[PDB]
Design an enzyme around this catalytic site. Structure first.
Site, PDB file in Angstrom:
ATOM      1  CE  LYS A 148      48.512 -43.169  -3.525  1.00  0.00           C
ATOM      2  NZ  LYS A 148      48.067 -45.114  -3.582  1.00  0.00           N
TER       3      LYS A 148
ATOM      4  CB  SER B   9      45.154 -46.589  -1.877  1.00  0.00           C
ATOM      5  OG  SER B   9      45.698 -45.721  -1.528  1.00  0.00           O
TER       6      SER B   9
ATOM      7  CB  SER C   6      46.524 -43.240   0.463  1.00  0.00           C
ATOM      8  OG  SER C   6      47.857 -43.808   1.191  1.00  0.00           O
TER       9      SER C   6
ATOM     10  CE  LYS D  60      43.421 -44.003  -2.127  1.00  0.00           C
ATOM     11  NZ  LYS D  60      43.302 -44.129  -0.840  1.00  0.00           N
ATOM     12  CB  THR D  61      40.948 -45.067   3.864  1.00  0.00           C
ATOM     13  OG1 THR D  61      41.520 -45.954   3.397  1.00  0.00           O
ATOM     14  CG2 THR D  61      39.445 -44.075   4.296  1.00  0.00           C
ATOM     15  N   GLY D  62      43.795 -43.340   3.920  1.00  0.00           N
ATOM     16  CA  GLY D  62      45.574 -43.897   4.342  1.00  0.00           C
ATOM     17  C   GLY D  62      45.820 -44.171   5.401  1.00  0.00           C
ATOM     18  CB  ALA D  63      47.466 -46.628   6.563  1.00  0.00           C
TER      19      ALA D  63
ATOM     20  CD  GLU E  73      52.418 -43.921  -2.314  1.00  0.00           C
ATOM     21  OE1 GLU E  73      52.809 -44.277  -0.822  1.00  0.00           O
ATOM     22  OE2 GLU E  73      50.786 -42.967  -1.659  1.00  0.00           O
TER      23      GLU E  73
END
Ligand SMILES: OC[C@H]1O[C@H](O[C@H]2[C@H](O)[C@@H](O)[C@H](OCCCCCCC3CCCCC3)O[C@@H]2CO)[C@H](O)[C@@H](O)[C@@H]1O
Length: 265
Positions: free
Chosen positions: A48, A105, A45, A209-212, A141
């Site tokens: 983005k 997100s 993510s 900004k984080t993501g997994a 996505e």
């Protein structure tokens, strides 16, 4: 906490995965810590932020407006659309879509924006235009989170991502208002920002900004510093670890703790 590099190593030992990490001065680009900085990691993510940099570049050129309302259909929605599923009747502005993508997100918001910049190929072309010859987006996505072992699709490197975020936030490639907007979206992250603040000592700035993704993939792109200043860009990716999401979070937080306890380097 041990020194940053020692803690990064300890995190790989504990997770049985690869960590990639850059710590960079935001104003100058000085690189302070680099670990696997030239190796590829799934962006998940975190892409983005670059996506909305491409949107802002179009706004600056007069080819887009943050005010412009986009209408979409239920059939356009993908998994995890907390904001966008509420606006089937009334649509969302381009700027609202970026806020939903970065600060929640929202995946459908991201795909709607990706369409406006020419898809994965368009965003990759934008990256090349700003001098990032490494980062690549290939899918939409949510397939871009698949993180297959050895798959180069939808990847960056810690060094490339840090240099790219520096370029977007500070290099005057974007207009002053655009740079300020991209920063404010990161400051406003609702997914991880408040949690991070709850464990940061008083006086430490955070924007993020984080993501997994699959196979343990995790990422954070962040601005961090004491005295309430965005002093440094910190980019951390994890891949190919079987660890729980809690343990991956704890290990990333442990790297942050080592940075905080040994800031003056
Ligand atoms: O001496 C430094 C500080 O040491 C401790 O602070 C601890 C804190 O109590 C703990 O909650 C945090 O966890 C780390 C939390 C980091 C959150 C994620 C960081 C992100 C940000 C940037 C991208 C990478 C990761 O570590 C610091 C440093 O040991 C003390 O509690 C605090 O009074 C003191 O000012």
């Amino acid at each position: 906490s041990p020194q940053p590099l020692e803690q990064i190593k300890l995190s790989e030992s504990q997770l049985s995965g690869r960590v990639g990490m850059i710590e960079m001065d935001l104003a100058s680009g000085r690189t302070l810590t680099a670990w696997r900085a030239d190796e590829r990691f799934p962006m998940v993510s975190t892409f983005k932020v670059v996506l909305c940099g491409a949107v802002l570049a179009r706004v600056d050129a007069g080819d887009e407006q943050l005010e412009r309302k986009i209408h979409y259909r239920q059939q356009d929605l993908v998994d995890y659309s907390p904001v966008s599923e509420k606006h089937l009747a009334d649509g969302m502005t381009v700027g609202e879509l970026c806020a939903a993508a970065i600060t929640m997100s929202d995946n459908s918001a991201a795909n709607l924006l990706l369409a406006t910049v020419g898809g994965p190929a368009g965003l990759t072309a934008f990256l090349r235009q700003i001098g990032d010859n490494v980062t690549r987006l290939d899918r939409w996505e949510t397939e871009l989170n698949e993180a297959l072992p050895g798959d180069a699709r939808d990847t960056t490197t810690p060094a490339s991502m840090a240099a790219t975020l520096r370029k977007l936030l500070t290099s005057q490639r974007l207009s002053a208002r655009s740079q300020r907007q991209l920063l404010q979206w990161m400051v406003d992250d609702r997914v991880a920002g408040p949690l991070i603040r709850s464990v940061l000592p008083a006086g430490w700035f955070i924007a993020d900004k984080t993501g997994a993704g699959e196979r343990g993939a995790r990422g954070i792109v962040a601005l961090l510093g004491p005295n309430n200043k965005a002093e440094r860009i910190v980019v951390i990716y994890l891949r190919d670890t079987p660890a729980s999401m809690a343990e991956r979070n704890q290990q990333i937080a442990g790297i942050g703790a080592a940075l905080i306890e040994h800031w003056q380097r």
